[PDB]
Amino acid sequence: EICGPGIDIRNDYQQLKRLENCTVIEGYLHILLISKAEDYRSYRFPKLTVITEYLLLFRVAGLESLGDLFPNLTVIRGWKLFYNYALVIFEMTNLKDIGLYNLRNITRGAIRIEKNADLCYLSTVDWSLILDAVSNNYIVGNKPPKECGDLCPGTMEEKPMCEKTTINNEYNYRCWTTNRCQKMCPSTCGKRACTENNECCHPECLGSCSAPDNDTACVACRHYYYAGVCVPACPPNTYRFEGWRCVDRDFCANILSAESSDSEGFVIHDGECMQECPSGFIRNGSQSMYCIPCEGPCPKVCEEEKKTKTIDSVTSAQMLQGCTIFKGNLLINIRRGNNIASELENFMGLIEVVTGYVKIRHSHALVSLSFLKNLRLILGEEQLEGNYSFYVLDNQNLQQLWDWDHRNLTIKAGKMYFAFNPKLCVSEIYRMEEVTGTKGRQSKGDINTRNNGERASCESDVLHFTSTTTSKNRIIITWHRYRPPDYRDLISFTVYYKEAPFKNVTEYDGQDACGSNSWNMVDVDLPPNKDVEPGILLHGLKPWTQYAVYVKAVTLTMVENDHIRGAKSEILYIRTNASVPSIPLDVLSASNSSSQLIVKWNPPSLPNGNLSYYIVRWQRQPQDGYLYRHNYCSKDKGPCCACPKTEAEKQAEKEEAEYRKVFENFLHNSIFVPREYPFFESRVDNKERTVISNLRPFTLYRIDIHSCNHEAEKLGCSASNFVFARTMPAEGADDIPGPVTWEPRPENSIFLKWPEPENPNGLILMYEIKYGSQVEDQRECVSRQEYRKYGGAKLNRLNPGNYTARIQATSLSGNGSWTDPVFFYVQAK
């Protein structure tokens, strides 16, 4: 009586005649597009009790109340959701009552009940009792609440019979239709269910039951239904099916297929009989009782219902995402594209093996198939005419296949036929022959010395570098004077340069719209003097790298054609000290401890270089006499919520700013007629960090960070980029080192004298004398100069009596320690 898989019904009522025996539809259910409205309440299915997956009702004409059609539908499990909902009521023509009065809970998903024509009573449904995470319930599009006439038994006239429940301060009746209420199981059950007239159900139960505390009496189980009993976990030797039941291996090979089905046969793993084994695991043959781990990324079969999965764009490769092996092939006909590779390395860069051919056709912007990294082997079962199991035709600007210095590839059951790729030189393919076990499998015309790399150029020689001068933003190099078979042939020398620090960059990574655009060319002609060799002076080269160099010539091929030799030199990697270095960046340092200072910086951005060694010059800086000569005792998707506009006139602003700047330039042109401490050095070795110690506790230090690199010797050092930092004051050095002395003076005056700190931190700015008779309220200031002149200070016109005093020093770092109590007295006479 377990109907499955999910049932579909549309365009007629008679299709409901397939629901007499359905109690738990093991799947989803669709009752949709019933536009006839021919029949009425003659189809009744009390047997239906649960839908494992979501339910979809749509355009069901002639239907007024679902509860009549599908009663006893105790619970919807909703293991699979439509979008995220376990029930769909879309554009319901004439439903008045939601019904489902026996429906009690929804395990997974929300509901969409919108834009119906005559539905209400949704307000009377307290989904909180039925549904968890109800905030996703989407019922906005229905009738305004005013008109539908929310009433039902109890809340109309007759004695109330619906229970009273509260949501968000709404303690009122809950119900489903005009004929019945919405009861909920008492808190006496807690999470447990119950039956009519408040008889509470078994713990392992849900929806409803027939007898109190009986496993076999439950209408719907809570988690898993087996052997006519609801159980909390899957009994041993039995293995969970999808959703709501346990079951033993035998069928799990036997559930072969029925219309919509895959296996044939379901495998058991992790204690459950799933459709296919999870990731990182492999089904060993037709076994279904367990599943063994594979090892690597094997568990992904990329198969598609088609045979030749043809690709023509990035959007064409989305389906193949994160997949390794296909029972098929490739076919590209891209006729335009920018940054396409960076996408295809991601979508299908994981493809690893193919059972057939790999075909490339009429692709312009394809430059070098290095953008498909993981292909290792090709079987060739799915072959072309003539058993060509690896094809590339009319690939205009193709440059070269996957890197072949370290990577390997194999073709098992076929050959390859490259044609009409004038930029696919024969050197890249003469290596393919020896590697994929196909050297003699085919003839040479299949690897024709024609169109293959045709404009990939006769047979190029090498231009010999005569010398390599260099500079600090300006490479140089010179090379052999080119002498063709006929001197009139050659016309110039296109001189390449890009920044390839890492030797893994070949002459064909980025050339010009053929190989992409990375090697930013520039050219210069041979001098008219045949006695002066072709030598050039690049410039404008950003710092940091082997802005490499190599020489080809833009030459003339005709009449003799193949006899026209052309030339291409080797890929030299002139370096820095060719682009000789420069100055620092990002200078910083701090004082963690006294007589210590951590200095750190970063690899500077324009040192025209690569790391050799770093130097910082730190010099003690003066404590300015300006501070000494001052008496401080008396001295005293963003904001566009209110975006005004998006100025496409930024270009007009550009021109206006250019006009202003040029006006200021000519303005400048014509306004004026023709017009104590040593340096300490500690080179770092290779890092931009170092530490400085043996420093006075509270001295201000200047920190000259340099790019004194490998060529600091020849070309002198770089500039000295600088920063200054202070040290951490010596704790306890600010306290007064000696006792205070007091002497009497006339006019009831007292003179106070004391010593000065031996090692003040920075400088002593002032002294704060605190004194008084009973409480030291009086506070007066003494400057360092005032202290020097008198060795202290004077207090005049003090009242008779005894006194206690204290003194504090104000260091440049902060306040000092208070002096010990000073006891003195003044007599009236």
Added chain:
Amino acid sequence: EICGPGIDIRNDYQQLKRLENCTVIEGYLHILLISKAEDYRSYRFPKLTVITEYLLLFRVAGLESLGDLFPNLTVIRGWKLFYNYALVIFEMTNLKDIGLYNLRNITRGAIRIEKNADLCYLSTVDWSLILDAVSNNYIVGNKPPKECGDLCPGTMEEKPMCEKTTINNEYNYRCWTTNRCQKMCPSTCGKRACTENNECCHPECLGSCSAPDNDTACVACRHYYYAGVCVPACPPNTYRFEGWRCVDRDFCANILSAESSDSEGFVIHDGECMQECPSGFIRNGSQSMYCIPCEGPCPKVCEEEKKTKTIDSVTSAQMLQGCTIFKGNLLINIRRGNNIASELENFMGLIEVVTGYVKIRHSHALVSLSFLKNLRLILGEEQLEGNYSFYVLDNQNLQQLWDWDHRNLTIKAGKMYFAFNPKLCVSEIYRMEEVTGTKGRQSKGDINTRNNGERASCESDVLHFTSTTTSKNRIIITWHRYRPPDYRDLISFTVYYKEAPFKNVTEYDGQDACGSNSWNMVDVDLPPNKDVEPGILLHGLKPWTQYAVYVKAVTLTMVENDHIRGAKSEILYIRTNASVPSIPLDVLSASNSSSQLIVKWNPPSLPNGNLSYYIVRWQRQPQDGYLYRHNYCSKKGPCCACPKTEAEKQAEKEEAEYRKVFENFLHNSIFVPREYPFFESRVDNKERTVISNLRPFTLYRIDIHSCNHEAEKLGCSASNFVFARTMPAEGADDIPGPVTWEPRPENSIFLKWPEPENPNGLILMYEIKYGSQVEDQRECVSRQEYRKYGGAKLNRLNPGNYTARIQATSLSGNGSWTDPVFFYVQAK
């Protein structure tokens, strides 16, 4: 004492020595970047009275009062503005009071006094009396208001001396500095001026004068100053110089230059001595007394300070926008660009002549130089080495220069050289020799059959179209079965197709990233059977365009290469009825008058056709009996609160596609294997027509077709349909005859009347209005009720006389009320 042009000073006080004799600085003034702050109020310039243009002060250290430096500055004309503004005080280091106490008016532009550390006394400067359009002023960023200490004589302690003026409900004192107030001419003086002690000046005056109503006493008058006298208009034989004065033609020609100067010599136009004559007019030689109209676009010289304006991007084409003749030479080196042409037709499509070379170096994406349209002639004075005054090297994807069918191009003083165009067919250049008269000016190697079009390739033959089958949204075609010197050569036959109705299209408009990307290639090869000639069946055609197709031969070049012939067939234009037709769009109509109805529609987007003539079938429609059998008597946008822009739109796309495929498989497996005639009036060429001789108020059906050029052979297209109602017959709804009344028992009255002869649409009901004194009672009679009885009955009426009226309810609207019906009912 008329210093000019504009004066500028910086970086030192000693440059202020250049203002002792300057009374009216005939230009702008810069006193900026004085960071020294060396001196103080020792430089005094009472003479300075007016600045013709804006005044800029910036970074003038050590200055606390501008009024001391530049007193008597009565008015600033501000003819030329800084940005839109006649005064800019930017980051004034220490200025305290603006001074300018003698300044009275600003003619053009506004002021910019912002972010000054120590500036004050702007709140008391009521710019309205000085300035027009005070709204744009911006003084938020300066010294904020709270401590500004805006006080001045009178408003502090002592007896008030500043006058009271009101702006936006603030009638209080105005002033300049702590020592002086803000005085202005009274309402007695009006727009017109005055001096101290309120002695009102002359009419043609401004700022200030010396004596009341005297031409020669004005300190700085209103509009124009000449011969020591102000005048309202520039006197005859004298010509207005820029801004504030007139000058005889002799001076207008004598002003050669002084450092910053253009003419050398100024020309006279419209009564004013201008730097250059305005647009559309030309200075005949060196004449300055007058300027004569030229004719066309001559008056715009494109000359640049540089000699070889090198072109490297669209941003490199802006400066020469809207320019016709360059006296130099131009170099394209764009290494990448999309839609660049469309831009350079506007930026540089107007250049016509050049006195020098045109050179193209290292341009990958340049495809056909047709986009530089206006270039007609090249003089060539500015030449390269070897007299190459028209040069092209390393244009990778060049296809074709300016269309040489109707376009002429000329070079006067040099030859031309083109190399490293692998895609420049020699047929594009062989005609150049005969157009610019340069056939012999250069050797054959100069326009060599070498590099020029090297992959413009060998030489193309032409195929024969054996037959041309065609279809209705889809093509077919065949051509001759070519036999090369060696059969193994050919590997496929290229099959282009685009939509080129206007026969002005060559194969090289947009081919593929070489010529741009327009001819959307797709290819099919020869069939295995040599007895079956190459045939093909394309698809994907958009309707209504005199379509385009052609073929070439894609060949293999080696061993002999040049002998590998290839081929190119003619650019055929398979057409409509080859792209056989389709069905209509955009049908509408309305009723302007009875028995008339205007019908209009649109030439469909899918006619697949040539306009030949349109057909409309209109049919009278029945009036539904449903209505008859019913008794009606009783019946920068939303982003002010923008939530987000879903970059997850791709994920939404996948979810939607998943749902659609789900529904597709769901559809697959749900079900196991399962009163009037037509009238026609063909339009001729337009999509409009009229239909007449129609019943006044009958609803019509309007079938509009694409029954077009070849509706003959393949029958008509679909018949796209709409309805439309006519205007009701005015006056046909009125009752045609009188009403009759009869007595009935129970004080009842029976009313009978005739029916409209030609009701408009249908008579739904009758509204009888009756009463004794006032016809208050209103009752309804249905059409069926009237038919059964010929009227209606009224029962239980009170005794007395009565008057009644009746109205009919037509489908178009209410009818006309009946004439008064007089009747009476007796109690017994």
